[PDB]
Amino acid sequence: LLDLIWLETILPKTISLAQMKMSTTITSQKGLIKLYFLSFLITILISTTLLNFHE
Amino acid sequence: LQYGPLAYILGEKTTKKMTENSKLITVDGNICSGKSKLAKEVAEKLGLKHFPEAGIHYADSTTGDGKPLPVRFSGNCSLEKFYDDPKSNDGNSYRLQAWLYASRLLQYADALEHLLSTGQGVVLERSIYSDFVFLEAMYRQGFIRKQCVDHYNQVKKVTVCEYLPPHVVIYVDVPVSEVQSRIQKKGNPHEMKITSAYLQDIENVYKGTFLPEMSEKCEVLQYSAWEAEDAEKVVEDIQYLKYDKGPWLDQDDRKLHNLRMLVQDKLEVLNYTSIPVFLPEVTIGAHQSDRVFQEFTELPGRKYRAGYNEDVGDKWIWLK
Amino acid sequence: MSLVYMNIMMAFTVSLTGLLMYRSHLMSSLLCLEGMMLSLFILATLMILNSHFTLASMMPIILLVFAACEAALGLSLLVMVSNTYGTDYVQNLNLLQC
Amino acid sequence: MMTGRQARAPLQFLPDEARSLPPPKLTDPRLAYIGFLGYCSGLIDNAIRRRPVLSAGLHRQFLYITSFVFVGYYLLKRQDYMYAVRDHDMFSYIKSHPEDFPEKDKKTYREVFEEFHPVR
Amino acid sequence: TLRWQEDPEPEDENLYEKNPDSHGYDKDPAVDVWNMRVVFFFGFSIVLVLGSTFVAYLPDYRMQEWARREAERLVKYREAHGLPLMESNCFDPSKIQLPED
Amino acid sequence: MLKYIIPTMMLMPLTWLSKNSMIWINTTLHSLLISLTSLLLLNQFGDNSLNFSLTFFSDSLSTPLLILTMWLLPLMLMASQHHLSKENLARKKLFISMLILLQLFLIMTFTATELIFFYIMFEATLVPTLIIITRWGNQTERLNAGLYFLFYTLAGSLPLLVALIYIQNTMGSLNFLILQYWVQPMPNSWSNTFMWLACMMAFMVKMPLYGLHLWLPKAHVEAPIAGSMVLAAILLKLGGYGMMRITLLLNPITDFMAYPFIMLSLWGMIMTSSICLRQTDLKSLIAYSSVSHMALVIVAILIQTPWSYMGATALMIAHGLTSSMLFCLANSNYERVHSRTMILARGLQTLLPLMAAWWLLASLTNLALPPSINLIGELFVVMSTFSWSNITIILMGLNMVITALYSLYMLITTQRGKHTHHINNILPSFTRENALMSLHMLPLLLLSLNPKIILGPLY
Amino acid sequence: MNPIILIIILMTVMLGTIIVMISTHWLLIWIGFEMNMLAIIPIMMKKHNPRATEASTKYFLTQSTASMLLMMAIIINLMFSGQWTVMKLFNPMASMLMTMALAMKLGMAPFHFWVPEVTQGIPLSSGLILLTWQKLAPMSVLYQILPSINLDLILTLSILSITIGGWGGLNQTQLRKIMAYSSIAHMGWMTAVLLYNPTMTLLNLIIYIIMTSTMFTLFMANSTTTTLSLSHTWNKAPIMTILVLITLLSMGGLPPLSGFMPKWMIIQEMTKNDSIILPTLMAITALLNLYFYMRLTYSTALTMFPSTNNMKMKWQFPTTKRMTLLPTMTVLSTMLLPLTPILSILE
Amino acid sequence: PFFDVQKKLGVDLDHWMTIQSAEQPHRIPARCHAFEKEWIECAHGIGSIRAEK
Amino acid sequence: KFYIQEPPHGSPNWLKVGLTLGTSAFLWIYLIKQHNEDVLEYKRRNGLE
Amino acid sequence: IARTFFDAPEKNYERTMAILQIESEKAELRLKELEVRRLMRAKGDGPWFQYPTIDKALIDHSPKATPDN
Amino acid sequence: RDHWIHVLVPVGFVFGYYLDRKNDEKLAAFRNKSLLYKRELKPQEEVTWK
Ligand SMILES: CCCCCCCCCCCCCCCCCC(=O)OC[C@H](COP(=O)([O-])OCC[N+](C)(C)C)OC(=O)CCCCCCCCCCCCCCCCC
Ligand SMILES: CCCCCCCCCCCCCCCCCC(=O)OC[C@H](COP(=O)([O-])OCC[N+](C)(C)C)OC(=O)CCCCCCCCCCCCCCCCC
Ligand SMILES: CCCCCCCCCCCCCCCCCC(=O)OC[C@H](COP(=O)(O)OCCN)OC(=O)CCCCCCCCCCCCCCCCC
Numbered sequence A: 001l002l003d004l005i006w007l008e009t010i011l012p013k014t015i016s017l018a019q020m021k022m023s024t025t026i027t028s029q030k031g032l033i034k035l036y037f038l039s040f041l042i043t044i045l046i047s048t049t050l051l052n053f054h055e
Numbered sequence B: 001l002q003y004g005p006l007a008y009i010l011g012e013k014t015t016k017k018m019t020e021n022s023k024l025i026t027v028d029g030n031i032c033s034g035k036s037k038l039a040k041e042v043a044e045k046l047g048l049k050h051f052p053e054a055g056i057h058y059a060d061s062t063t064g065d066g067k068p069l070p071v072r073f074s075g076n077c078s079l080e081k082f083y084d085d086p087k088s089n090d091g092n093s094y095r096l097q098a099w100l101y102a103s104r105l106l107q108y109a110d111a112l113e114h115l116l117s118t119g120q121g122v123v124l125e126r127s128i129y130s131d132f133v134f135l136e137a138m139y140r141q142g143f144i145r146k147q148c149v150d151h152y153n154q155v156k157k158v159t160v161c162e163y164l165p166p167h168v169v170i171y172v173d174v175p176v177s178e179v180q181s182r183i184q185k186k187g188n189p190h191e192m193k194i195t196s197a198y199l200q201d202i203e204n205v206y207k208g209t210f211l212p213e214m215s216e217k218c219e220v221l222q223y224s225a226w227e228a229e230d231a232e233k234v235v236e237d238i239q240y241l242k243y244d245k246g247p248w249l250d251q252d253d254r255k256l257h258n259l260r261m262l263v264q265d266k267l268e269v270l271n272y273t274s275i276p277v278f279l280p281e282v283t284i285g286a287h288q289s290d291r292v293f294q295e296f297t298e299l300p301g302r303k304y305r306a307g308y309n310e311d312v313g314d315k316w317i318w319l320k
Numbered sequence C: 001m002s003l004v005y006m007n008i009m010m011a012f013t014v015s016l017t018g019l020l021m022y023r024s025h026l027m028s029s030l031l032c033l034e035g036m037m038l039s040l041f042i043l044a045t046l047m048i049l050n051s052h053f054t055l056a057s058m059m060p061i062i063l064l065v066f067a068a069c070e071a072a073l074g075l076s077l078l079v080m081v082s083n084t085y086g087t088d089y090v091q092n093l094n095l096l097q098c
Numbered sequence D: 001m002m003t004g005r006q007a008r009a010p011l012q013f014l015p016d017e018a019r020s021l022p023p024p025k026l027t028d029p030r031l032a033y034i035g036f037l038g039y040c041s042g043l044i045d046n047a048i049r050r051r052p053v054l055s056a057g058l059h060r061q062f063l064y065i066t067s068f069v070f071v072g073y074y075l076l077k078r079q080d081y082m083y084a085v086r087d088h089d090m091f092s093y094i095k096s097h098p099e100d101f102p103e104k105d106k107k108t109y110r111e112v113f114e115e116f117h118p119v120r
Numbered sequence E: 001t002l003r004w005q006e007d008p009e010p011e012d013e014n015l016y017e018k019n020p021d022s023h024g025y026d027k028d029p030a031v032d033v034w035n036m037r038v039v040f041f042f043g044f045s046i047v048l049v050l051g052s053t054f055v056a057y058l059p060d061y062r063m064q065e066w067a068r069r070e071a072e073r074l075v076k077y078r079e080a081h082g083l084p085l086m087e088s089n090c091f092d093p094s095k096i097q098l099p100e101d
Numbered sequence F: 001m002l003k004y005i006i007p008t009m010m011l012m013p014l015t016w017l018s019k020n021s022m023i024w025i026n027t028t029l030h031s032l033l034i035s036l037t038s039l040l041l042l043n044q045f046g047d048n049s050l051n052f053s054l055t056f057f058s059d060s061l062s063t064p065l066l067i068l069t070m071w072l073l074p075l076m077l078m079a080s081q082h083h084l085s086k087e088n089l090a091r092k093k094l095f096i097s098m099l100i101l102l103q104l105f106l107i108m109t110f111t112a113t114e115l116i117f118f119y120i121m122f123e124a125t126l127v128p129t130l131i132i133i134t135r136w137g138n139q140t141e142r143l144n145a146g147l148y149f150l151f152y153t154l155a156g157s158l159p160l161l162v163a164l165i166y167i168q169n170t171m172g173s174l175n176f177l178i179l180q181y182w183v184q185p186m187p188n189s190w191s192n193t194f195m196w197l198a199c200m201m202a203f204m205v206k207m208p209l210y211g212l213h214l215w216l217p218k219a220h221v222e223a224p225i226a227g228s229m230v231l232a233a234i235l236l237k238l239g240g241y242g243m244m245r246i247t248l249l250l251n252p253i254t255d256f257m258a259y260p261f262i263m264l265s266l267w268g269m270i271m272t273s274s275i276c277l278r279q280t281d282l283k284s285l286i287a288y289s290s291v292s293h294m295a296l297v298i299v300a301i302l303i304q305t306p307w308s309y310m311g312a313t314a315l316m317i318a319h320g321l322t323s324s325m326l327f328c329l330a331n332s333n334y335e336r337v338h339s340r341t342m343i344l345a346r347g348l349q350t351l352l353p354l355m356a357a358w359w360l361l362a363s364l365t366n367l368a369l370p371p372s373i374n375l376i377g378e379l380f381v382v383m384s385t386f387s388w389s390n391i392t393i394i395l396m397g398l399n400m401v402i403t404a405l406y407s408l409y410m411l412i413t414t415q416r417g418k419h420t421h422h423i424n425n426i427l428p429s430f431t432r433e434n435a436l437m438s439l440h441m442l443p444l445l446l447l448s449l450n451p452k453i454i455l456g457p458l459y
Numbered sequence G: 001m002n003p004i005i006l007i008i009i010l011m012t013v014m015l016g017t018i019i020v021m022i023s024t025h026w027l028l029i030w031i032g033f034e035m036n037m038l039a040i041i042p043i044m045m046k047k048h049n050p051r052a053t054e055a056s057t058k059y060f061l062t063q064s065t066a067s068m069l070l071m072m073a074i075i076i077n078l079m080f081s082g083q084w085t086v087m088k089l090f091n092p093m094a095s096m097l098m099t100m101a102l103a104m105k106l107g108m109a110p111f112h113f114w115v116p117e118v119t120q121g122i123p124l125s126s127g128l129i130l131l132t133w134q135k136l137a138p139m140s141v142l143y144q145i146l147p148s149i150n151l152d153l154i155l156t157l158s159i160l161s162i163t164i165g166g167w168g169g170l171n172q173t174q175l176r177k178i179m180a181y182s183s184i185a186h187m188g189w190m191t192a193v194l195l196y197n198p199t200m201t202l203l204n205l206i207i208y209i210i211m212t213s214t215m216f217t218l219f220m221a222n223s224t225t226t227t228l229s230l231s232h233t234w235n236k237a238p239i240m241t242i243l244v245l246i247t248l249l250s251m252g253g254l255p256p257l258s259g260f261m262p263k264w265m266i267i268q269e270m271t272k273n274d275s276i277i278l279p280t281l282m283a284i285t286a287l288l289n290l291y292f293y294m295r296l297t298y299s300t301a302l303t304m305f306p307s308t309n310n311m312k313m314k315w316q317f318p319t320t321k322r323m324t325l326l327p328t329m330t331v332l333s334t335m336l337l338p339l340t341p342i343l344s345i346l347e
Numbered sequence H: 001p002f003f004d005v006q007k008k009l010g011v012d013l014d015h016w017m018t019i020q021s022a023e024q025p026h027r028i029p030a031r032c033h034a035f036e037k038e039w040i041e042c043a044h045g046i047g048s049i050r051a052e053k
Numbered sequence I: 001k002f003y004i005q006e007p008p009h010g011s012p013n014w015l016k017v018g019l020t021l022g023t024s025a026f027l028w029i030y031l032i033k034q035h036n037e038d039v040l041e042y043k044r045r046n047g048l049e
Numbered sequence J: 001i002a003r004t005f006f007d008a009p010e011k012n013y014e015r016t017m018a019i020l021q022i023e024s025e026k027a028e029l030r031l032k033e034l035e036v037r038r039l040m041r042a043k044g045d046g047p048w049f050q051y052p053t054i055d056k057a058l059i060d061h062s063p064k065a066t067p068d069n
Numbered sequence K: 001r002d003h004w005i006h007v008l009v010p011v012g013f014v015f016g017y018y019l020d021r022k023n024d025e026k027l028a029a030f031r032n033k034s035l036l037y038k039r040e041l042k043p044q045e046e047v048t049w050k
C-alpha cells in the first residue's frame, strides 16, 4: 500500500505526469504562421495594457 | 583532402579534363547472357577501364589488402544458400539483395569518381539503375515479403536521386531456354536449381519496366545473342551515337564539382543504406554486432587507419 | 507632441495589426511590410525636417534603400513557394510541424 | 561594471599598468593544467581519427600543448591584471569615502551578551 | 518471422573444469596464482597485521591518557591546599560583566 | 591531502598502461598500498583537528570515512572481476577508471574545508555512479534506476547550493574553521525555516529519509556488485557527514524543527523492518535494512547530543562494513544460481559450509551482537534518544525484535532446510570470494578491540 | 553553390555582425541587422528542398517584423532624445519596443515559435551557423542598453523562455528540435542575469556557444539527424559515443563539468541582490533539460541499440570529414571548471 | 560586447551624424543647438547615474 | 607492400611536419622571451632588484 | 611513529593560526567589496558603473549661419 | 627497468609528501609567534620547525 503505491504516487508520479501533460500541451502547435503572428499580437496587447511594460 | 573547394577555386575545373571519349557504359543482360566478357571487349577497344560486376566481396577487394573478407564479416549472406533454398526462414534473400545493391552503389560511386577525376570512361555491369528488376523477380516468386520491397524502395528513393544515369546502356537479349542451356553447361551445381519462372520473370521485368523507363534519360542499344559475340559492331555503334538526351547535357562545372564532393566521401555515399528501419532480414542484434565488430577490429590491417598499422609494416608512425 | 505625429503613429499601428493577423495570402503581408516601412520613413523625415537636423537627411533615403533589401527578397522567397505549390497560401506552409 | 574604466583606452588586452604586476611563473599550476588540457586535446584528436593515441603524431601533440600554454599564459596575465584592478579600485573607494565606512568597536566577550539555548 | 537475428545465449563457464586448482581470479593458472599471492600478501600480511600493529601503538590518541595524568596532578594540588575540586563557574566571576536588569 | 590525491590520480596511468590481463593485479596491489598509507591520518589531537592547508583538513570524523573508502577500493576491484571476465579490454579499463575516479571524488569530498568545494565533490560523485549503474547493470530496470537515483538527489541539492551561496553573502566566508568562531544564532522566522529546509533536505534525500527513500530499493537491486558496495557503504554517509557539518549553523532553530523528520524516521524504521519481514528478494531486503539503519542515524544526528553523534558515526562505519559484506554474499549467491529469488536456493549449508559460516557471521553483525561496533553505535543512539524522551525506547525496542526477525530469516531461507532438487550447478567456494569476505569481516571484528578511532570528533 | 559565392556570403554575415558590434549609431545597428538577415537567408537555402523554403519564409517574416519594431523604437528614441548615441534610452515605450524586437530576434519565448521549425527545416551547417553566430549581435545590443530595460519585462521573458524550452524539449525525437529548445532555455538563462552583472551573461554566452558547437560538430561527424541514427553510432565509432555522452552530461549543468560554470555563478549573482526564489525555480526548471539530455545519453551511449547488416561495410571506410577543432572544443566544453576565475578577463 | 574599434584606430565612421551639434554642412545650426550643447557639456564624463539627477 | 591501394597518409608530410616543429619552437622561444622581458620590466618598475 | 610520520602539535597549531588569519582577511575583504559595490551602484561616483554618455569633443564651436544659437 | 609500471604510485606518494612539505613552509606566518608555544631560540637552531 504505502511504499509501493502511495509514496510512489504522491512525489514522483504526480510531477512525472504533470511534465508529460505540459510537454504534450506546449508542443501541439499546428505549425501555421498566422496563428504564431496572432499570438505575437496578443502578447503585445497584453504587455501594452494589462502588464504595463511600457511604463 | 586531396580535392577540395580550394582546389576548385585555384583552377582545377572539371569540364577541362572531360573529352568526348569520357562515356559511362553499363552493359546489361540476363544471368548467362555472355556480357561478362563482352563488356571487357568494349574495355579493350575504346580504351575504357573495366569494372567487374559488384558481388558480395567488392568492398573487401576495394580496401585493405584486397583479399576477400570472411562471410561473417562482410555480407553475412550466401548466393549458394539462396540458390538452394530461396524461401529460407532466416531472410537470406533480401539480406543478399540489400548487400548487393549497396555494393553496386559503392561501385557506381567509384566509377563516377574515376570518370570525374581522370576523364577516362568506365564500363560497368548491372549498375544501380537495373538492380531492382532482380528484386521484382524475388517478389514475383514469393521469395520475400512486401516489407522488403518497401524498404528497398525507400533506400533507392533516398539514394539514387543524387547520382547520374550512364551515357550508354547495352542490353543483351538471350531467351530463357538458351539461358538455361548455358547455365547447365556452366557446371556450377548451385546454379542448376534456378527455376525457369525466375529467369522468365527477370526477362519480363527487364523488357517491361527497366528499358521503357530507361530509354528517356539515356540511349539504349539492344542486342541479340549472336550480335553480342562480335564486339566490332558494338564499338562501331557506340562510336557513332548522337548524344542528345539525358541530364548530362545541362551540367556546369559547379554541378560536377558538387557531385565529386559527394561521391569521394564514401561514408556520405553509404549513409542512407543503413536506415534505422527494423526488418527481420537486415536487423542484427546488439550482442551479435558487438561480437562481430570486436572480431573485425583485431584483424590485421583493420585496427587503425590505412597507414597507422604497425603489424603490417607501416613506418614513421610517430611522425604522422 | 503635435498632431501629424499622432496620425503617422496611428497609421503605423494600423499597418502593424494588419500585418500580425494573416489572411491566407503572402502578398498582403508583404504589402503590410511596405506600408510599415513607408510610415517609418514619413515619421523619420517629419521629425528630421522639423528639428533642422540637416546631416541626418542622409538617414531616411538610405533607410528606404534597405527596404528593398528585404522587400524584393520577400518576392524571391515567394517564387520557390509558388514553384512548390500552385498558389501562395500560407496554410500550405505547414510541413514543418513534426 | 568596470566598463567606464575601459572607456578612455578601449580594446587593450594589457594596458601600461599591467606591466607593474609580477608575471606568472612558467611553473604555475594553472599553466600546467592548461598544458594537460592540450595533451588531452591531442589524445582526442588521435583517438577520433583511428590513430594510435600514444604514438601517432608527436609533433601534433607538442604543437597542441605549446599553443595551449601560450594562450593560457596570456589569459592568466589578463586575469591577474583585472583582479589587481578590482582590489585597487575597492581600496581607493574605501579610502576616498571614510564616512560611508565608519569603524566599529570591538567589544570583548565579557561585555557582549549572548542568549543561551539549552539542548536537552 | 525470425525477428532480431541474435547470437544464442552462451552457457555458464566452470573455472574448475579446465583447471581444478583455480582460485577464481583468472582462467590462466599462472596469472590466477600470482593474483592470489598478491591479494593474500598485501591484504593480510601488510595492511592487516602491520596496520593493526600501527593502530595499537598510536602515540597517545586524542591525548586521552594525558588528560588523565594532568588531572592526577591537579587534584593533588587542590586537595592539598583545601580548595574545592571544581568551581561552579568555568570563568572567573570578577572578569565578566553582566547587563543591567 | 596531496599525498593521497596524487597516487589515486596516478592509478589511471597504471590501469591504462598495464598489460593485456595484468590490470586487476596491478590495480589491486597499488590500491592496497594506498590503503596501507591511509593510516597516517590518525594524527588526531584532543582539541585541535589536523589542518593540512587552506583547502584540505581532516578531523576525527572524516578520517574513518577516508580509511573506509581507500580500504573499500581494492575490495571493489576484487568483487567486480568475475562478471567482467567476458568484457572488452577497453570497457574493463573504463570500468576500473570509473571506480578510481569515484574513489578520488570521495576522498576529496571528506577533507574539504570549504562547503562549496564539499558540495561540488558531493555532486561530482553522482556521474560515475550513474554511469556504472546505467551501463554495467544486468536488468532492464537499471535505466529507470538511472533516473530515480539522479533526479531525487539534485532536487534536494539544487536549492541547498543557493542557501550555501547565501551564507557566502551573509557571513563573508564558507570555510568551516572560520564558521566555528563566527557562527550566529538563528532566530525563529519563515526565512530561517525555509533556509533550514534547503540546507537539510539534500542530506535527508541522500541518506535516505523514509518517504524519500524510493530511489534506494531501485538503485540497489539493478546495480552491479561494485555499485551496490558504493551506494551501501560510502554514498549513504555523505548525507550524514553533511548533516554533521551543517547542523552548526542551524542553531537554535533545530529544536522545534526536527520534530516531523524525527517522527518520520522513527516510524520509517518500523515500516522498513516490517517490509524486510516480507521481501522476496535478498537485494531488496539489504536495501531496506540500509534504509532503516540510516533512519536511525538521521534520528541520532537530529537530536544532536555527544552520545548521539558518537553512536551515529559508529553506526555509519559498522553499517557500511556489514552492508558491503551482505551485498557481496548476495552477489556470490546470484553468480552461482543466476537468480535473485530468496526461496529458490535453499539448504546451502549442506553444500557450502564456509559460506554458511560467513552468512551466519554477517547476520550476527547485522543484528548488532555485542561487543561489535554495531551494538556500540546502536546502543549509544538508544541512550541518547532515551535522554531525549522516555517513550522513544519503545519505538527502539520493538524495532530491535523485528531486526532479529529478518536477519536470521535471511539466514534460514538461504542456509537451512532441505536443499532444492533441480539445482545442480552449485560450485564450491572460490578462494577469491572467501578472501573477499575475510577482508570484509576481519577489520570489522578487529575494530571492537579499539573503537576509540571511530567515535567521532568529540571523543 | 559556388565556393567563391559561399565565402563572400559568409564574409558578409561576419561583416554585418561586426558592424552591429562596433558601431556607435543606431542607423548603423539597423543596417548591420538588415545585412545580416539578407546574407543569412540563402545559407538555409543551400540544398533547395521545400522545407528550406518554409524555414526561410518563416525566418524572414519574423526577422522583418523584429527589424520594423527595432526601427520604430529607434525613431521614437530619436524623437524623445534628438541624438543617435547607442546608450541608454529616454523613453520607456522605446525600451519596451526594443526589448520585444530583440526578444523576437533571439527567439525567446513567447516569440519562440519559429525556432524549432526553422532549425528542423535547414541543414546542420546552417542550423549551427544560425543558433551560434546569429545570437551574438542582439546580445551585444542588449548589453549596450543595460540601464533601459524594464526589470519585470526581461525577467518575465527569461522565466517564460526557460519554462517553455524545458517543457518543449521533452516531446522531441529530432535532434535539431532538441537543440532549438535547449537554445531557448539557455536564452532565458542568459537574459535572467543580464540586469545584475552582464559579465556572467558573456560567460554563459561563451560556454553555450562552445557546447552547442561541440554537439553540432559531433552530429556532423556521425552524420546523424534523428535519435535512431545517433543510437546506431555505437557500431561505427564508440569514441564518438563517449564524446557525446560527456558533452550532454556537460550541458545538463552537472559538476565537475564546464556546464556548471555559468549557472552556478548566475545564482551567485542573484543572491547578492536578494533574489532567492528565481534561481531556485530556474534550477528546478533546468532539471528538465537535464532529463532529456539523460534520455539522449541513454539512447546513444549507455545502451547498445540494435543495428543493421549494412553497417559492416561502413566498418571498412574510416571518416574523412573535416572535423575542425573538435577535440579542442570538446576539452573546452568538458574540463574547464578549475579555471573558473578566467572569466575575470571578460570585465 | 562593444569592441570600440573606432577610437582604437582613430577612424571616424559615424560620429558626425550622432548629434546635431557636430560639423554640419555650411555651418547650418539645429533649432535646439544651444540646449543640446549645454546638456552634453553638463553630462560629460560624470556617468549616466550621476547625469540622470 | 600490404595494402591494395596507396593510403593518403602512407608517407609523412614533411612540409607539414617541418611547419609544425618550426611553429612550436617559435612559440616556445617567443613565450620565454616575453616572460623574461616581463619579469625584468616588473623588477625595474618596483625597484625590487 | 611520532618522530617518523606524524607532525608536531606546535606545527599544526601555528599552521591553523595562519590558515585562520588568511581566511578571516579574505572574508573581511569580501564583505568590504560587497559594501563598495552596493554603494557604487547606489551613488555612481566611483570608477565602477560608469555608463557611457555623449562626448563633448563632437560639439562644433565655429560661428554658424544664424546668430541665435 | 622491466617493471616501470610498479613505480608510479610510490613516486606519486613521494611527490605528494614533498609537495606537502613545500606547502607547509608557505604557511609559516606565525612560526614561533603563537601565544602558547612561543620560546626563545635554542643555540644552533634557526627555526622552530620546517
Ligand atoms: C577505521 C575506519 C575504517 C574501517 C576499516 C579499516 C580497514 C583497514 C584495517 C587496518 C588494520 C586494523 C585496524 C584496527 C586495529 C584494531 C585492533 C587493535 O590494534 O587494537 C588495539 C588494542 C590496544 O590495546 P590497549 O589500547 O588496551 O593497550 C594500550 C596500548 N598499547 C598496546 C600500546 C599498550 O590492542 C589490543 O587490545 C590487543 C590485545 C592483545 C591481543 C588480543 C588478546 C585477546 C584475544 C582474544 C582472546 C579470547 C577471547 C574469548 C574468545 C572466545 C571465542 C570467541
Ligand atoms: C527532493 C524533494 C524535496 C526537496 C526539498 C528542498 C527544500 C525545500 C525548500 C527549498 C526552498 C528554496 C530554497 C530556499 C533557500 C533560502 C535561503 C535564504 O536565505 O532564505 C531566506 C530568504 C529571505 O529573503 P532575503 O534573504 O532575500 O531577504 C532578507 C531577509 N528578510 C526576509 C528578513 C528581509 O528567503 C527567501 O528569499 C525565500 C525562501 C523560500 C523560497 C520559496 C520558493 C521555493 C519553494 C520550494 C521549491 C523546491 C523545489 C520543488 C521542486 C523539486 C523537484 C521536483
Ligand atoms: C563575449 C563575446 C564573445 C564572442 C566570441 C567569438 C568567437 C569567434 C566566433 C565563434 C562563433 C562561431 C563561428 C563558427 C560558426 C559556424 C561555422 C560553420 O558552421 O562552418 C561550417 C563548416 C562545415 O564543415 P564541413 O563538415 O566540411 O561541411 C559540411 C557540409 N556543409 O564547419 C563546421 O561545421 C565545423 C565547425 C567549424 C567551426 C568550429 C570552431 C568555431 C566555433 C566554436 C568556438 C570554438 C572556441 C573559440 C572561441 C571561444 C569563444 C566563443
Ligand SMILES: Nc1ncnc2c1ncn2[C@@H]1O[C@H](COP(=O)(O)O)[C@@H](O)[C@H]1O
Binding pocket: B030, B031, B032, B033, B036, B053, B096, B097, B100, B101, B131, B134, B135
Ligand atoms: N540482385 C541479385 N539478386 C540475386 N542474384 C543476383 C543479383 N545480381 C546478380 N545476381 C547473380 O549474379 C549472377 C550473374 O553474373 P554473371 O554470370 O557474371 O552475369 C547470377 O548468378 C545472378 O543470379
